[PDB]
Design a protein around this ligand. Structure first.
Ligand SMILES: O=C(O)c1ccccc1O[C@@H]1O[C@@H](CO)[C@H](O)[C@H](O)[C@H]1O
Ligand SMILES: O=C(O)c1ccccc1O[C@@H]1O[C@@H](CO)[C@H](O)[C@H](O)[C@H]1O
Lengths: 451, 454
């Protein structure tokens, strides 16, 4: 289980261990140095969308504290840091003039990492769309993909000489369905037409980003970060099994199929295709450019059952109950085997590049007692899932690295600051960072690498 | 006694100094949404996001009034109509809501008002007709008290430039729409459905109105200040004690939310009992600022709001449901035509509230006929005007201070969630050619209005 020296023995000597973070979740300084609002600033500040109307004005104050945070990462002995770049700082209206002050912040951040021997994994888009782009229709408008194309080039032109890796998007599933169909994330739409348009334009923007990054910075390996869902049927009935496949096509295939097969899932196209935006002739060629790596985000299985309610929109599924009785403080089922079956399914179904676990972590809300944080269930979560990752390596899968999700407690989207995911406790009143016991344990594991 | 046109008989019923006008709104007619420093409004975003507006129609082109304004003023002049009521685009004047003033934006309305003065057309400006700068959504939009101060500063900036020539100014057009329809019902931008959001919008728009009144008089004390409201004509389904109570709750929520703070310096009591706990912070000076004396007010009327008690358990205040229509006549947008509801509404308001002079700022009808042989035969629109103008003349006879009337829609235009499909104009616009064609209703209105001032 939790014996780190024994766990470490199961990984190759060149395995990459990392910690990860996202711009709006930690940075604060929302109106500083030319930054303009993102769709999340708007979402937060409109009553109804976010717990307690919590916003990102301060968060972890990382914009000002970035040096201490980097020193913390070095002191933990962690080889890699994955962060996202705030489009609203770089090109504040989305289109329009470049904010060189904005590029400067990430320019210094990357330099600080280089000096400290910390490998840099940058994500171009982790949900903070500049608000002004909503004027054109946001992700529902194709022009937004070209705004992204230009943004991608702008960032890589400045950073591409030092970045160890880059990912275009993190979790299209959230930016697409959760944001435009379910109304849970910004901009909070609930419309199938809007969502399908967002779907294609995000896929297209990804393809634009790959291309742009390679024209300016060909040495930098390009990736895409996806929260692929481990879809588990409620039963072995034909009904529930056919449900599981429809769910897979809609929740995963909507992104994996275009990127890795250069097509949309056919059954999904039959049901939803007529409400999709224009797909120009070169679109799927651009979307399906070969990647150097991909990032898997995993937390919990997606248990589905057939939903035979009349007129139900594709995929016509409903939530099946948790088999495990272990749950995190946000209520997510803990079931590590669903990570093994997921990776197994994906590598059978698609031609994938090397894989990095880019997010895996757990919500537990204990704070500081006697200068320490006893977050044993988080420690246990990492041990179990890292064990699975080690199994996958054994089984022959190209698992090259693992990023622990959440360097520190932060703004957790619709949950506000109530749900803590970090390895490092952050006291929001004092901004004091406190390494948790899970973090001390992860640091012990990671410190031994590379061997 | 010999035959007389209806417009001449009608004209005899109005006092010699009655004011006749036509009216428009900036986003509905201007187009040119990305020139001369304009940044997007919440309606640009609403239009372009699939699901909110018919056909995803937007305001990019509209009637191209930004470029054809002189021709449109000439049309007004030729119609012999005394007054022009228009709105000013905040996204043109202060593109980010807060931030640098866009002089180019101000220049447009500066030249427009000069063109009206040069033509002898009286100018009635509306400062806000729903086109909030998109950037203000970053702070929460109308749900944030700061937005009220952003409006305040915008109002001041506008009036400092135009105040020497404007005949009247209204701060807002239809709070009901910007508040409930936009933040509770989800039908208008920004399309929220949240009571907490709506109550914040409610108070901050009431507050912004008061700020605007003070700002306008500070820098242009000569200009008469008003507020334009779509007061709903609430008609109970019956005189049962239960429907009667429903009608009063409906009145408090749909009208009193705005009339009580503005004209009585307080919110309706039963509404507070049900909703007060979810309202934003009301500071010490708020209601005295909101309730400043006005020089006039504008009534928007189209159709009645017929209500019955809604016994649905747990129903949110005011807990009413739609009651059946009495007339079977409807416009092409589906609204009951029922002119006497205008009479009972003005009666009700003048007995409940201490109100200044009244101008009918919007009255009109959706009918969609186009051009045939150079003409638009829109007799049902003409009949709507003649009948409602008869009600207005009746209200004058009955002792109410009705000082003027603006026919709503000078021209066919962008109709919000309906897009360009619903035509409200006295002037037809062919959206392919941008050709204006004065309709038969418009020629009739022109013949009436030209006689004034007598
Ligand atoms: O945000 C969600 O609701 C979500 C749900 C399922 C799978 C992934 C999700 O997003 C990741 O989880 C977040 C936890 O709140 C993290 O903060 C990450 O930022 C994010 O990438
Ligand atoms: O949109 C409504 O449901 C509404 C209802 C009652 C009173 C006014 C209303 O909006 C006004 O009517 C518009 C017609 O589409 C006009 O074009 C005006 O611009 C607007 O002020």
């Amino acid at each position: 289980m939790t014996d780190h020296k024994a766990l470490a023995a199961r990984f190759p000597g060149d395995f990459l261990f990392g910690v990860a973070t996202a711009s709006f979740q930690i940075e604060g300084a929302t109106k500083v140095d030319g930054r303009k609002p993102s769709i999340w600033d708007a979402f937060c500040n409109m009553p109804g969308h976010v717990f307690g109307r919590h916003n990102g004005d301060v968060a972890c104050d990382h914009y000002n504290r970035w040096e201490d945070d980097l020193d913390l990462i070095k002191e933990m002995g962690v080889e890699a840091y994955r962060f996202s770049i705030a489009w609203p700082r770089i090109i504040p209206d989305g289109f329009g003039p470049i904010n060189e002050k904005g590029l400067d912040f990430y320019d210094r951040l990357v330099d600080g990492c280089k000096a400290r021997g910390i490998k840099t994994y940058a994500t171009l888009y982790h949900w903070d769309l500049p608000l002004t782009l909503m004027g054109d229709g946001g992700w529902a408008s194709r022009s937004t993909a070209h705004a992204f194309q230009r943004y991608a080039k702008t960032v890589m032109a400045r950073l591409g000489d030092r970045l160890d890796a880059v990912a275009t998007f993190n979790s299209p599933w959230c930016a697409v369905w959760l944001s435009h169909l379910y109304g849970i994330h910004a901009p909070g739409e609930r419309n199938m037409e809007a969502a399908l348009a967002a779907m294609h334009h995000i896929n297209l923007a990804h393809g634009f980003g790959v291309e742009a990054s390679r024209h300016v910075a060909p040495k930098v390996p390009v990736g895409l970060v996806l929260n692929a869902h481990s879809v588990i049927p409620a039963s072995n009935s034909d009904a529930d099994m056919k449900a599981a496949e429809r769910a897979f096509q809609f929740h995963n295939g909507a992104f994996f199929d275009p990127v890795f097969k250069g097509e949309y899932p056919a059954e999904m196209i039959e049901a939803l295709g007529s409400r999709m935006p224009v797909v120009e002739a070169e679109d799927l060629s651009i979307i399906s450019q070969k990647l150097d790596w991909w990032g898997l985000n995993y937390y919990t299985p997606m248990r589905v059952a057939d939903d035979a309610t009349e007129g139900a929109e594709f995929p016509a599924t409903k939530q099946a109950p948790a088999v495990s009785d272990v749950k995190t403080d946000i209520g997510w089922e803990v079931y590590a085997p669903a990570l093994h079956s997921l990776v197994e399914t994906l590598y059978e179904r698609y031609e994938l590049p090397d894989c990095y676990i880019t997010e895996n972590g757990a919500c537990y809300n204990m704070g500081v007692e006697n200068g320490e944080v006893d977050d044993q269930p988080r420690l246990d979560y990492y041990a179990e899932h890292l064990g699975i990752v080690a199994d996958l390596v054994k089984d022959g899968y190209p698992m090259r690295g693992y990023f622990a999700w959440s360097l520190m407690d932060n703004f957790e989207w619709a949950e506000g600051y109530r749900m803590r995911f970090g390895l490092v406790h952050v006291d929001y009143e004092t901004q004091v960072r406190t390494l948790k016991n899970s973090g001390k344990w992860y640091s012990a594991l990671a410190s031994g690498f590379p061997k």
